[PDB]
Enzyme design. Sequence first.
Site, PDB file in Angstrom:
ATOM      1  N   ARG A 234      43.938  14.207  -6.408  1.00 18.27           N
ATOM      2  CA  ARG A 234      44.472  14.922  -7.592  1.00 18.27           C
ATOM      3  C   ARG A 234      45.794  14.324  -8.028  1.00 18.27           C
ATOM      4  O   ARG A 234      46.829  14.982  -8.015  1.00 18.27           O
ATOM      5  CB  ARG A 234      44.562  16.410  -7.224  1.00 18.27           C
ATOM      6  CG  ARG A 234      43.259  17.130  -6.991  1.00 18.27           C
ATOM      7  CD  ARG A 234      43.430  18.595  -6.686  1.00 18.27           C
ATOM      8  NE  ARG A 234      44.181  18.893  -5.469  1.00 18.27           N
ATOM      9  CZ  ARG A 234      43.821  18.540  -4.235  1.00 18.27           C
ATOM     10  NH1 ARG A 234      42.556  18.110  -4.000  1.00 18.27           N
ATOM     11  NH2 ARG A 234      44.677  18.316  -3.222  1.00 18.27           N
TER      12      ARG A 234
ATOM     13  N   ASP B 241      42.432  17.018   3.145  1.00 21.56           N
ATOM     14  CA  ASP B 241      42.086  17.362   1.805  1.00 21.56           C
ATOM     15  C   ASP B 241      40.826  18.072   1.503  1.00 21.56           C
ATOM     16  O   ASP B 241      40.287  17.733   0.357  1.00 21.56           O
ATOM     17  CB  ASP B 241      42.619  16.319   0.802  1.00 21.56           C
ATOM     18  CG  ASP B 241      42.902  16.997  -0.540  1.00 21.56           C
ATOM     19  OD1 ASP B 241      42.300  16.605  -1.567  1.00 21.56           O
ATOM     20  OD2 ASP B 241      43.652  17.990  -0.518  1.00 21.56           O
ATOM     21  N   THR B 242      39.962  18.374   2.441  1.00 23.17           N
ATOM     22  CA  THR B 242      38.642  18.957   2.020  1.00 23.17           C
ATOM     23  C   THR B 242      38.509  20.436   2.410  1.00 23.17           C
ATOM     24  O   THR B 242      38.380  21.287   1.576  1.00 23.17           O
ATOM     25  CB  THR B 242      37.478  18.059   2.519  1.00 23.17           C
ATOM     26  OG1 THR B 242      37.758  17.938   3.960  1.00 23.17           O
ATOM     27  CG2 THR B 242      37.320  16.720   1.781  1.00 23.17           C
TER      28      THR B 242
ATOM     29  N   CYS C 139      28.236  13.140   4.574  1.00 27.63           N
ATOM     30  CA  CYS C 139      29.431  13.515   5.319  1.00 27.63           C
ATOM     31  C   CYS C 139      29.239  13.566   6.802  1.00 27.63           C
ATOM     32  O   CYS C 139      28.403  14.350   7.348  1.00 27.63           O
ATOM     33  CB  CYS C 139      29.904  14.942   4.889  1.00 27.63           C
ATOM     34  SG  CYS C 139      31.529  15.195   5.637  1.00 27.63           S
ATOM     35  N   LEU C 140      30.141  12.882   7.523  1.00 23.57           N
ATOM     36  CA  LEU C 140      30.130  12.961   8.997  1.00 23.57           C
ATOM     37  C   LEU C 140      30.821  14.236   9.524  1.00 23.57           C
ATOM     38  O   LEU C 140      30.466  14.641  10.666  1.00 23.57           O
ATOM     39  CB  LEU C 140      30.747  11.695   9.601  1.00 23.57           C
ATOM     40  CG  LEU C 140      29.866  10.428   9.403  1.00 23.57           C
ATOM     41  CD1 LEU C 140      30.689   9.211   9.703  1.00 23.57           C
ATOM     42  CD2 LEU C 140      28.672  10.620  10.354  1.00 23.57           C
ATOM     43  N   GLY C 141      31.891  14.605   8.882  1.00 21.91           N
ATOM     44  CA  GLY C 141      32.693  15.758   9.278  1.00 21.91           C
ATOM     45  C   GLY C 141      32.096  17.104   8.974  1.00 21.91           C
ATOM     46  O   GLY C 141      32.809  18.112   9.100  1.00 21.91           O
TER      47      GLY C 141
HETATM   48  C1  HEM Z   1      34.331  20.986   2.928  1.00 19.13           C
HETATM   49  C2  HEM Z   1      34.574  19.901   3.596  1.00 19.13           C
HETATM   50  C3  HEM Z   1      34.009  18.484   3.250  1.00 19.13           C
HETATM   51  C4  HEM Z   1      33.398  18.037   2.165  1.00 19.13           C
HETATM   52  C5  HEM Z   1      33.109  18.760   0.832  1.00 19.13           C
HETATM   53  C6  HEM Z   1      33.152  16.617   2.343  1.00 19.13           C
HETATM   54  C7  HEM Z   1      32.525  15.798   1.425  1.00 19.13           C
HETATM   55  C8  HEM Z   1      32.204  14.470   1.630  1.00 19.13           C
HETATM   56  C9  HEM Z   1      31.362  13.665   0.742  1.00 19.13           C
HETATM   57  C10 HEM Z   1      30.975  14.087  -0.693  1.00 19.13           C
HETATM   58  C11 HEM Z   1      31.171  12.500   1.342  1.00 19.13           C
HETATM   59  C12 HEM Z   1      30.362  11.293   0.789  1.00 19.13           C
HETATM   60  C13 HEM Z   1      31.090  10.494  -0.303  1.00 19.13           C
HETATM   61  C14 HEM Z   1      30.291   9.326  -0.836  1.00 19.13           C
HETATM   62  O1  HEM Z   1      29.035   9.362  -0.676  1.00 19.13           O
HETATM   63  O2  HEM Z   1      31.022   8.669  -1.692  1.00 19.13           O
HETATM   64  C15 HEM Z   1      31.787  12.545   2.660  1.00 19.13           C
HETATM   65  C16 HEM Z   1      31.839  11.559   3.601  1.00 19.13           C
HETATM   66  C17 HEM Z   1      32.588  11.550   4.760  1.00 19.13           C
HETATM   67  N1  HEM Z   1      33.305  12.630   5.279  1.00 19.13           N
HETATM   68 FE1  HEM Z   1      33.468  14.428   4.430  1.00 19.13          FE
HETATM   69  N2  HEM Z   1      33.625  16.236   3.592  1.00 19.13           N
HETATM   70  C18 HEM Z   1      34.123  17.383   4.187  1.00 19.13           C
HETATM   71  C19 HEM Z   1      34.806  17.418   5.387  1.00 19.13           C
HETATM   72  C20 HEM Z   1      35.118  16.313   6.163  1.00 19.13           C
HETATM   73  C21 HEM Z   1      35.971  16.326   7.334  1.00 19.13           C
HETATM   74  C22 HEM Z   1      36.785  17.518   7.837  1.00 19.13           C
HETATM   75  C23 HEM Z   1      35.997  15.070   7.807  1.00 19.13           C
HETATM   76  C24 HEM Z   1      36.777  14.484   9.008  1.00 19.13           C
HETATM   77  C25 HEM Z   1      36.658  15.136  10.189  1.00 19.13           C
HETATM   78  C26 HEM Z   1      35.133  14.268   6.960  1.00 19.13           C
HETATM   79  C27 HEM Z   1      34.743  12.950   7.223  1.00 19.13           C
HETATM   80  C28 HEM Z   1      33.940  12.181   6.412  1.00 19.13           C
HETATM   81  C29 HEM Z   1      33.565  10.796   6.652  1.00 19.13           C
HETATM   82  C30 HEM Z   1      34.018  10.007   7.902  1.00 19.13           C
HETATM   83  C31 HEM Z   1      32.741  10.427   5.679  1.00 19.13           C
HETATM   84  C32 HEM Z   1      32.120   9.039   5.397  1.00 19.13           C
HETATM   85  C33 HEM Z   1      30.687   8.814   5.926  1.00 19.13           C
HETATM   86  C34 HEM Z   1      30.143   7.424   5.519  1.00 19.13           C
HETATM   87  O3  HEM Z   1      30.677   6.837   4.531  1.00 19.13           O
HETATM   88  O4  HEM Z   1      29.104   7.154   6.125  1.00 19.13           O
HETATM   89  N3  HEM Z   1      34.506  15.090   6.060  1.00 19.13           N
HETATM   90  N4  HEM Z   1      32.397  13.792   2.832  1.00 19.13           N
HETATM   91  C1  LIG Z   2      34.780  11.788  -1.712  1.00 17.27           C
HETATM   92  C2  LIG Z   2      35.450  11.940  -0.345  1.00 17.27           C
HETATM   93  C3  LIG Z   2      35.258  13.473  -0.113  1.00 17.27           C
HETATM   94  C4  LIG Z   2      34.864  10.998   0.797  1.00 17.27           C
HETATM   95  C5  LIG Z   2      35.742  11.317   2.025  1.00 17.27           C
HETATM   96  C6  LIG Z   2      37.160  11.598   1.415  1.00 17.27           C
HETATM   97  C7  LIG Z   2      36.927  11.364  -0.125  1.00 17.27           C
HETATM   98  C8  LIG Z   2      38.050  11.910  -1.008  1.00 17.27           C
HETATM   99  C9  LIG Z   2      36.654   9.820  -0.317  1.00 17.27           C
HETATM  100  O1  LIG Z   2      37.484   8.986  -0.597  1.00 17.27           O
HETATM  101  C10 LIG Z   2      35.240   9.566   0.306  1.00 17.27           C
END
Ligand code: HEM
Ligand SMILES: CC1(C)[C@@H]2CC[C@@]1(C)C(=O)C2
Length: 405
Positions: free
Chosen positions: A177, A242-243, A348-350
């Site tokens: 943002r 941030d999420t 998403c991994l997280g």
């Molecule tokens: C409400 C919580 C969350 C939402 C809405 C969210 C959403 C996303 C989305 C939309 C992506 C895919 C983006 C792409 O395809 O361009 C992603 C990937 C990822 N998220 Fe999250 N996320 C959340 C929480 C988290 C948390 C807490 C972590 C860390 C512990 C995290 C770690 C990651 C990682 C490592 C990836 C990349 C996976 C890859 O590229 O294979 N996420 N997430």
């Molecule tokens: C779209 C996302 C939620 C995903 C993990 C953090 C984020 C802001 C990115 O840059 C990739």
Amino acid sequence: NLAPLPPHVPEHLVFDFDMYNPSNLSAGVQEAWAVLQESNVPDLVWTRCNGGHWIATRGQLIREAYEDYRHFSSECPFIPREAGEAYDFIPTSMDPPEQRQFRALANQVVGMPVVDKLENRIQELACSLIESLRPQGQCNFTEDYAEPFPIRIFMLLAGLPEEDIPHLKYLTDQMTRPDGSMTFAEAKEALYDYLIPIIEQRRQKPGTDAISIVANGQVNGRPITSDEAKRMCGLLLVGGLDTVVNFLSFSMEFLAKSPEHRQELIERPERIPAACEELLRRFSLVADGRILTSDYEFHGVQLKKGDQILLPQMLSGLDERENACPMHVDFSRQKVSHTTFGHGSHLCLGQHLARREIIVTLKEWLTRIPDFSIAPGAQIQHKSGIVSGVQALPLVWDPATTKAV
Ligand code: HEM
Ligand SMILES: CC1(C)[C@@H]2CC[C@@]1(C)C(=O)C2
């Protein structure tokens, strides 16, 4: 500031949406994005804002586009272009098969097994924070809970000082943002400056923190490089900070205004997991995109190589074609359809981590503070971007209606 329409774009496909300042933001962030799914809007539009880019508006197109890495490359995933150009996070700026190995590593640090391990601290911290708030009969939910809760847990995971929070948070916010105060590149460099030292240290003197594991990991048989680790950690940071933070506020804003929903959760607690899904669907908050690798005709629209397209993860679950009465919150929907956590290779991994955090919060909050609302005469303001947010959430409640545990 609208950018002159490229020659390959038909005028009838123009819809000038500003992902960073959608028109009826007042109505709420999700409602503001939903304008894109009204009848007068084609499935695929071109906006002249933010340099010009395509937007896919239907669950179906977003899903497909996400599957198709061949055509839709993660290389430049943020709009505008300058930001997407600067973006080099791992594994998100990588396409398969290169993606695969980095993904496996990141999984080691955040997957199921880690969540399972940390479950007791999550529960401990949420209970601690709620109990501390309870007798005040008033907080700033965004600053009082939504922030510290998830953050402190990530910091624990990462083995980083809680002292760094304010600084890290400013920088992460700058990416999702944008303020205007700093460019994406500038922001990324500053986060990188923070991490470099720390990585070096953990390459030498490893620990058990997530950073230590990433720094000393193996990718494609060989040792990850310093740059690679810096780049994965950059991602972890944005993700931890941030999420879950923003999501919680949206959920809580909703729960504050719907007595009947809170009550449902209190009497039929076996519904909490179902409700978590529905909330994830309805208060979906990420929008990123992909880059055309070549000229490609997609749903009768001719995309050119280098064209950026925003495929709003937020939008799938809100599409009436996917879920009947999409703006309505129903904890007993037979089918909760969304792509809140993405689709295709980058899923998403997280997510496991996020789900645990939410679910704990709901059970633990309602147990102690069953009855609460938004402070009278509060103007709740939402913010749009890569990750949408709530500016502040003033809540009030009667201490006498609370339950000490
Ligand atoms: C409400 C919580 C969350 C939402 C809405 C969210 C959403 C996303 C989305 C939309 C992506 C895919 C983006 C792409 O395809 O361009 C992603 C990937 C990822 N998220 Fe999250 N996320 C959340 C929480 C988290 C948390 C807490 C972590 C860390 C512990 C995290 C770690 C990651 C990682 C490592 C990836 C990349 C996976 C890859 O590229 O294979 N996420 N997430
Ligand atoms: C779209 C996302 C939620 C995903 C993990 C953090 C984020 C802001 C990115 O840059 C990739």
